[PDB]
Amino acid sequence: PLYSLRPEHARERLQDDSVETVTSIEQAKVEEKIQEVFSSYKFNHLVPRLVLQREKHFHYLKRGLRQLTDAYECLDASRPWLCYWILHSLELLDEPIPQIVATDVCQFLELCQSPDGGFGGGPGQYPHLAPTYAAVNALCIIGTEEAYNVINREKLLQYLYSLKQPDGSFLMHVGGEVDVRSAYCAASVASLTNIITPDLFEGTAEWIARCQNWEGGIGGVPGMEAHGGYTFCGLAALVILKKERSLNLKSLLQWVTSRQMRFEGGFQGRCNKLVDGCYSFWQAGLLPLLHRALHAQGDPALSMSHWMFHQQALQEYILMCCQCPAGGLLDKPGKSRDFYHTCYCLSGLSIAQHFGSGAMLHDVVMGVPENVLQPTHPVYNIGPDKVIQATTHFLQKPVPG
Amino acid sequence: FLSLDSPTYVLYRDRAEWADIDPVPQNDGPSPVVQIIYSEKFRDVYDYFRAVLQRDERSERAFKLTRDAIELNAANYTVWHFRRVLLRSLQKDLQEEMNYIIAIIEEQPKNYQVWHHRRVLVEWLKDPSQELEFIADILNQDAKNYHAWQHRQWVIQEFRLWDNELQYVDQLLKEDVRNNSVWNQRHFVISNTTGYSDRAVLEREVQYTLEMIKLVPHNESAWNYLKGILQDRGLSRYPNLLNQLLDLQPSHSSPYLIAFLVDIYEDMLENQCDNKEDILNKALELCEILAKEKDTIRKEYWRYIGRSLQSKHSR
Ligand SMILES: CC(C)=CCC/C(C)=C/CC/C(C)=C/COP(=O)(O)OP(=O)(O)O
Ligand SMILES: [Zn+2]
C-alpha cells in the first residue's frame, strides 16, 4: 500500500522517553494532526486519491503572476522572487508561458535592474543578490532572446565585485551582511550569464566550507547551526565552482538523510525542528547533488535508480498534507498557502519523482501517473532544458573584463 | 509619532511639512505583473520615501518617514539602509535608536533586516552591554530563533564575551535538552575556548553527552554532538565507548544507537582491524536491521552503506 498507511508506520511515531520538552510537545502535535490526515486515506479509497490538484494550482499561479492582494505588501521588496516562484511553479506544472506575460515579465524585471548592475526587490530599489538571483533565474525560465538581453552582463559583473569580500564571502547587498545564500546567488548568476573571471570567486569555496558544521550540515556563517537552506546554497554553490570536495561529504550526506521525518515522510530544516514542505526541495535537493559528487569520485556503491532518501515517503507527505483546496501548496497542515512554498514543494516533488545518473533514468510517481512534474535542475532549480538553453546562449558572448 | 493606526493619522500627501516635495509614484510598466494592490497608506508613504530617496534628502522628516515605511514592510532592505544613512547624517542618538530596535525585534523576532540593523548599531556604539540579556529575552520567545543565535555568536566573538555562555548553554539545555540550537552553541563555545583536543575537555564532554543520552535515549541532538566531537578523531579508537554503548542496548536502544555502532565498525574496517570478516558481518547485519526495520525511512541510505562496507572490505 502507501508507506504512510501501512500498519507498522504507527511505530515511527515519536518516543519522548517520558521526558517532555517544548520540542517533544510540538512534534507530537504535528504527528497527531498528520496522523489524522493519514487515517483519512487509509479509511477511504475506491478510486485513486493521491492526486496533484494541478487545476487549482494553475489558477492560483495564473492569478498571482498578474495581481496580488495587500497581504503580499510584506514582499514589496521581493517582487522578482514572485516572478520566479510562480514561473518555476508553472514550468514544473508544464504550463507554458503566453508570449504576452513573457514580455511583461521581461519589462518588469528590466525596471528592477539597477543601472549599476543586479536587480532590486522592485523598480527603484537597491540591488540585492536575492532578487538578482531571482530575476536572472526567472528570465532564463522564459528562455527568450528578449529575456536574456534584459541582463546587462557588464554591470552584473561589477555589481558582483562590489559585494565580493577578501575572505571569499559576498554581501547580500551593499551595507548588508554575508552568509552562504549570497555566495549561492552570485555563483548561480555568474555561471549562467557567463561572467566568471579568474578572481571573482577567489577564496569563496574555502569560506563556504568553513560554514559546514559539526553536524555535517551547513549554517549561514561559520559556527552557526547547520540548516537545510544554507546547506543547499552551500553545496550547490560548490558544485558550480567544482569544489564540492572541499566539504566532508560523508558527514553532509548522513546529516541530510537524517532530516527526513520517519513518521511524516517529509523534511525538517534543522534537527529536532518541525517538518516543512519547502524543505522537500531544499533538503531533498541535496541528494541529487551529493550523488553527482560521489559519482564523479567514482563511488561504486551508488544506486542506479534511487536518490538516498525515501522518495516515496516525501511525495505522500506533499500530496497528502501540503495541498490547499483553493490552490497552491504549503508548509504543514495548519498553515496558510503562499507562492514561496508552492515553488518549493513542487520542486521537491519533481526531485523525488525523477532520478538520473549517467544514462540511468527511473521515475517514481506516487498516486496517479499524471502527477509527474517537469524535472528540475538540482542546482539552479529551473528546467534542465532551460539551464542548457541559457548557458549555451551566454557562452556565445565573451566573459566581461 | 503619529502611528499608522492613529484615528488622527494624516497622509503625507496632506501633511504641510511635506508640501514642498513632489512624491514619486512607483513605476511597474504598462502591464504590471506580480503587482500588489497596496493599501492607500502604504502607497502614500512609499510615494514619499521614493521622493526622499531620489533627492537623497538627509532630513529629520525623512528619518521619521522611514519608521512608517518599515512598519509597512520591515523587509525593505532599501529602507533599512537609507535610515542608517540618515542616522549618520543627522548624528542621531544611537541609544534612542537602540531602544527603537529593541522594541521592533521583540515584535518581529524572525526578521533578518531587524537584527542586521541591531548589529551595525552595536559595532558603531562598540557597546555590547545590553546584548546577551536581550538575546536571552528573545530566546525565551523562541529558543531556536536562528537570527537570535547568529547575533549572539557574533557578539560573543566580536566582543570576546566567552566567560559565561557555557553556563547559559547548561541553563538552556535543562530547559530543553532537545534544543539543537543549544547543542551547537555548546560546541561553538568549546571549540572557541579550550578546544576539543584538550583531552581533559574531550572526556568531560563525551561523559556529559553519555549521561544526556541515558536520560533521553531518543534525543538525536545528543547523539549528533557525540558523533561530531569524535568523528574526525576516529570512533573505533575509543574501546571504552563501544562497551558502554553496547551496555545501553538493553534498556536504552534506538536507531541512533545502532547507527553509531555502524560508524564504529566502519572505522574499524578502515583502520584495518582484526577479524575483518567478523566485523563486516556485524556491520552489514545492523545496516539491514536499519534498512528493513529500525530506520526504514533511510532504507536507501543504509543499503548504500552496507553496499560500501562490502565494496572495500570483502573477499
Ligand atoms: C536561496 C535561499 C535564500 C535559501 C534560504 C532558505 C531559507 C528559507 C532559510 C532560512 C529559514 C529561516 C531562518 C526561517 C524562519 O523560521 P525558523 O528559523 O523559525 O524555522 P525553520 O528553520 O525550520 O524554517
Ligand atoms: Zn517554509
XYZ file of C-alpha atoms and ligand atoms in Angstrom, chain A residues 81 133 172 181 184 227 229-230 233 269-270 273-274 276 279 282 340, chain B residues 110 142 144-147, ligand 1:
47
model
C 11.150 36.437 -6.179
C 19.331 35.532 -8.322
C 23.829 40.324 0.232
C 22.954 32.121 0.438
C 24.997 30.832 -3.925
C 20.420 24.193 8.195
C 18.547 26.243 3.216
C 22.101 27.355 3.763
C 23.075 27.031 -1.143
C 15.254 22.206 8.103
C 17.153 21.580 11.319
C 12.699 21.059 14.366
C 9.322 20.555 12.701
C 8.160 21.673 6.272
C 12.444 21.551 2.658
C 15.955 22.309 -0.005
C 7.022 30.520 -1.832
C 12.141 36.468 12.751
C 11.742 31.162 20.566
C 15.547 28.171 18.224
C 15.459 31.582 16.548
C 18.262 31.238 14.042
C 18.656 35.005 13.830
C 18.348 30.627 -1.530
C 17.928 30.976 -0.093
C 17.690 32.428 0.180
C 17.817 29.991 0.834
C 17.441 30.014 2.295
C 16.298 29.062 2.688
C 15.673 29.533 3.962
C 14.169 29.658 3.812
C 16.488 29.758 5.028
C 16.191 30.234 6.435
C 14.966 29.738 7.214
C 14.537 30.593 8.384
C 15.644 31.378 9.077
C 13.210 30.574 8.716
C 12.411 31.276 9.804
O 11.747 30.222 10.528
P 12.610 29.344 11.547
O 14.044 29.800 11.587
O 11.953 29.551 12.933
O 12.395 27.778 11.299
P 12.957 26.780 10.186
O 14.480 26.956 10.192
O 12.601 25.333 10.351
O 12.326 27.376 8.915
